């Protein structure tokens, strides 16, 4: 009975790739060429921050495009004023091991979470002049990978086992559960239109998830190792995946195929984080070779190195309008290029 | 000397800096002990002797506060979250020492110590712990010495060539995994031969970390 099941399995698997094979027309390089490259473009650090005591893991921008949040190994979540370097306030955590921090679009709430398979949500705009734990979702047995607010009331989280969960703030019960990937999940990016999202897994698989329907819309297979970072295009109909094999790749939702591969023979070590900017023109990537490359999405060639970090780059980010670019690495400093 | 807003917003940085620099030296007085090795075998009982997700245990003696990172129920990939524990002073590995005599096996007709060896080789050659000295505990000494008489050790492994005495048979298998070390210069392996009736089974590791501490200082100043 299992033989026919397996046979139909490879038949269905071969059906999909045959459809994908006939869909491709031409490489992205041949259509993105014949235009002037950006050239050598790098800038000094206009601001430089301090205060952290250990390696930072995650940090997120704001809707106001000025305020910032940051999280490190030590149990501190610090709020930054980028223009004038003064710390707005700090929030003590309960677990040192944290990998996820996020800033709500309205600015009222922040989200944190690490190796304890829980997601805490604190309230910023409090009448009593403090920051209090609004909610604490606990529905996983593992470790959180990425947190991205969908609205003031809906939050999507990626668990470390195999799954993702769309939650409700008022009641800790999960609204929806997405299963698959047959392995751990590392990165979770959410669309600007707040209707779709993707996830990167340790099994070289990326799956589109429908927010309302709750079923896997598409599945992407690529790279020979783990996937650590992913981020939507500002248009919202594409994404980029960073992998442990020292190579990034570009994917389009409707194309369902690879478009561009970014790699360099000088580096052999993998990518820790990836991020975009305004107009989707500069793909910034933070590696663990102590540097932080900045390459054009259309042309994979190098366009600038933001060297100046004493350890491996962990985080990234860009302003909503596209003005400045923050960073952050395993050295406690958190620079803000512009 | 700026406007009224900034003259009161540059004092927020002052208090946050004083809180951060005050709470950043309070956590630098504690030692961090990883237990990437098996702990559910017999180390739970040891935890109960001193006094799902990451299990943080806090204890103290001789003016040193120890943070034991019991990673027991993670049940995920051991390579993704292993760099988070880089920088710990020591890694407590544990062996029940009651498997060759018992022939418990159950790993698909494979003795458990082959898996234990495999784990020790995986952890002792890891890139993140090249400067960290493993500290090995061996438990269930009384049971092993009481049921080693009737148990044929050579049947499990023909490489052994010795008598059935408890104080010479066990020494053969130590090199099996100790010789697997690829860097004998700094990654020393310690042993204590703990017992369940033993009363002083933690003092050992304390001495051990002192050997790791003082030598580490000699790396900084440069006496070596």
């Amino acid at each position, epitope marked *: 009975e299992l033989d026919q099941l397996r046979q139909e399995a490879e038949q269905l698997k071969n059906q999909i790739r045959d459809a994908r094979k006939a869909c491709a027309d031409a490489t992205l390089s041949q259509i993105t060429n014949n235009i002037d490259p950006v050239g050598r473009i790098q800038m000094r650090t206009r601001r430089t921050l301090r205060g952290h005591l250990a390696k930072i893991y995650a940090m997120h921008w704001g809707t106001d495009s000025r305020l910032l949040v940051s999280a490190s190994q030590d149990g501190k979540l610090i709020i930054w004023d980028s223009y004038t370097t003064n710390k707005v306030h700090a929030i003590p955590l309960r677990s040192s091991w944290v990998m996820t921090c996020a800033y709500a679009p309205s600015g009222n709430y922040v989200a944190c979470g690490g190796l304890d398979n829980i997601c805490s949500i604190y309230n910023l705009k409090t009448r009593e002049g403090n920051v209090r734990v609004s909610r604490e979702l606990a529905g996983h047995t593992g470790y959180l990978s990425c947190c991205r607010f969908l609205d003031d009331n809906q939050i999507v989280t990626s668990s470390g086992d195999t799954t993702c969960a769309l939650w409700d703030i008022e009641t800790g019960q999960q609204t929806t559960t997405f299963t698959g990937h047959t392995g751990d999940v590392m990165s979770l990016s959410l669309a600007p239109d707040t209707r779709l999202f993707v996830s990167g897994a340790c099994d070289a698989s990326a799956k589109l998830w429908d927010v309302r329907e709750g079923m896997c819309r598409q599945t992407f297979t690529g790279h020979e190792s783990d996937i650590n970072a992913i981020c939507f295009f500002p248009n919202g109909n594409a994404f980029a995946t960073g992998s442990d094999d020292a190579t990034c790749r570009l994917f389009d939702l409707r194309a369902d195929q690879e478009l561009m591969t970014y790699s360099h023979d000088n580096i052999i070590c993998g990518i820790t984080s990836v991020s975009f900017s305004k107009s989707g023109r500069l793909l910034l990537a933070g590696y663990d070779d102590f540097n932080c490359n900045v390459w054009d999405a259309l042309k994979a060639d190098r366009a600038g190195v933001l060297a100046g970090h004493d350890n491996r780059v962990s985080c990234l980010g860009v302003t909503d309008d596209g003005m400045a670019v923050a960073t952050g690495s395993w050295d406690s400093f958190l620079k803000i290029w512009n | 000397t700026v406007s009224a807003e900034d003259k009161a*917003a540059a*004092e927020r940085s*002052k*208090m946050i800096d004083k809180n951060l620099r005050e709470d950043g030296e309070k956590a630098a007085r504690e030692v961090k002990l990883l237990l990437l090795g098996a702990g559910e075998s017999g180390k739970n009982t040891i935890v109960k002797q001193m006094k799902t997700g990451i299990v943080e245990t806090h204890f103290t003696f001789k003016d040193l506060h120890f943070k034991m990172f019991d990673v027991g129920a993670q049940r995920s990939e051991r390579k993704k979250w292993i760099h988070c524990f880089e920088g710990v002073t020591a890694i407590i590995f544990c062996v029940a020492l009651s498997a060759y005599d018992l022939v418990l096996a159950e790993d698909e007709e494979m003795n458990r110590m082959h898996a234990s060896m495999k784990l020790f080789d995986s952890i002792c050659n890891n890139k993140w712990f090249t400067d960290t000295s493993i500290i090995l505990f061996l438990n269930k000494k009384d049971l092993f010495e009481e049921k080693i008489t009737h148990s044929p050790l050579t049947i499990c492994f023909p490489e052994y060539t010795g008598a059935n005495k408890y104080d010479e048979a066990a020494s053969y298998i130590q090199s099996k995994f100790e010789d697997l070390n690829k860097r004998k210069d700094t990654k020393e392996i310690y042993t204590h031969f703990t017992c369940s009736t033993d009363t002083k089974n933690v003092q050992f590791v304390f001495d051990a970390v002192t050997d790791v501490i003082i030598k580490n200082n000699l790396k900084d100043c440069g006496l070596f």
Partner: single-chain antibody
Framework: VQLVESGGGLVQPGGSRKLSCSAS????????MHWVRQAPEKGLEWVAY????????YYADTVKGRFTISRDDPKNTLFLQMTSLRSEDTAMYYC??????????????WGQGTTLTVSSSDIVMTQATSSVPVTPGESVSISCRSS???????????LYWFLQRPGQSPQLLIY???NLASGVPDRFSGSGSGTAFTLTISRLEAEDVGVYYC?????????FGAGTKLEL
């Protein structure tokens, strides 16, 4: 959320006295402590200040060497001590705590205040109207002017549009740039154009009618303009 104010009665000049305020059931360890004095015929003026950590104390134009703020949150001892009291000090006092962030709402909440009877280069703004008679059912539009440039190089102009309902305590309407405050109906509005500032009330009710005041102060001394009490 609430203030417990201690102080009041009849005194004589030259006698030191302390006026205290407590914010029990409310975090206040990081709040500035503006103190405000009431003129029965004129606008409120700021008389004393202290910042978070007790590392900064300010004073008004003609009060140096006369007031002193003492703040100690462990024992909830938060008060003003009077030095060299003079006869012309028959007035009432408010205690307003506020702290400054980016995107914050300075002066968002106000205290209750207490009266006190005594035996018998400053920036000045101009009120368009004063002592206007009260009339229900009429929309209110009030204009104000500033002596100097409102726009600081940081881009944070000072546009305070405090409102006072007939009663005990006032409320804020506009703090920085035409932005509404907390605990206030949406019927109110504010706007500015150059040196011309405007307060607008379209819908009227039993609580919409009140007194209005404005601040625009780049320097330490804070003082309202002429009183625009509709009830007068």
């Amino acid at each position: 959320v609430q203030l417990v104010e201690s102080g009041g009665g009849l005194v004589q000049p030259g006698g030191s006295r302390k006026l205290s305020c407590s914010a029990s059931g409310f975090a206040f360890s990081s709040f500035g402590m503006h103190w405000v004095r009431q003129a029965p015929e004129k606008g409120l003026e700021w008389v004393a200040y202290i910042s978070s950590g007790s590392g900064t104390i300010y004073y008004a134009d003609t009060v140096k060497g006369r007031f002193t703020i003492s703040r100690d949150d462990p024992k909830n001892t938060l008060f003003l001590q009077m030095t060299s009291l003079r006869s012309e000090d028959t007035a009432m006092y408010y205690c307003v705590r506020s702290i400054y962030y980016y995107g914050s709402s300075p002066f968002d909440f106000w205290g209750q205040g207490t009266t006190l009877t005594v035996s018998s280069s400053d920036i000045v703004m101009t009120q368009a109207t004063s002592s206007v008679p009260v009339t229900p059912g009429e929309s209110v539009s009030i204009s104000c002017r500033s002596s100097k440039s409102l726009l600081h190089s940081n881009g944070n102009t000072y546009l305070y549009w405090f409102l006072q309902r007939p009663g005990q305590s006032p409320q804020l309407l506009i703090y920085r740039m035409s932005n509404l405050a907390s605990g206030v109906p949406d019927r109110f509005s504010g706007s500015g154009s150059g040196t011309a500032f405007t307060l607008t009330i379209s819908r009227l009710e039993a609580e919409d009618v009140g007194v209005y005041y404005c601040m625009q102060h780049l320097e330490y001394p804070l003082t309202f303009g002429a009183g625009t009490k509709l009830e007068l």
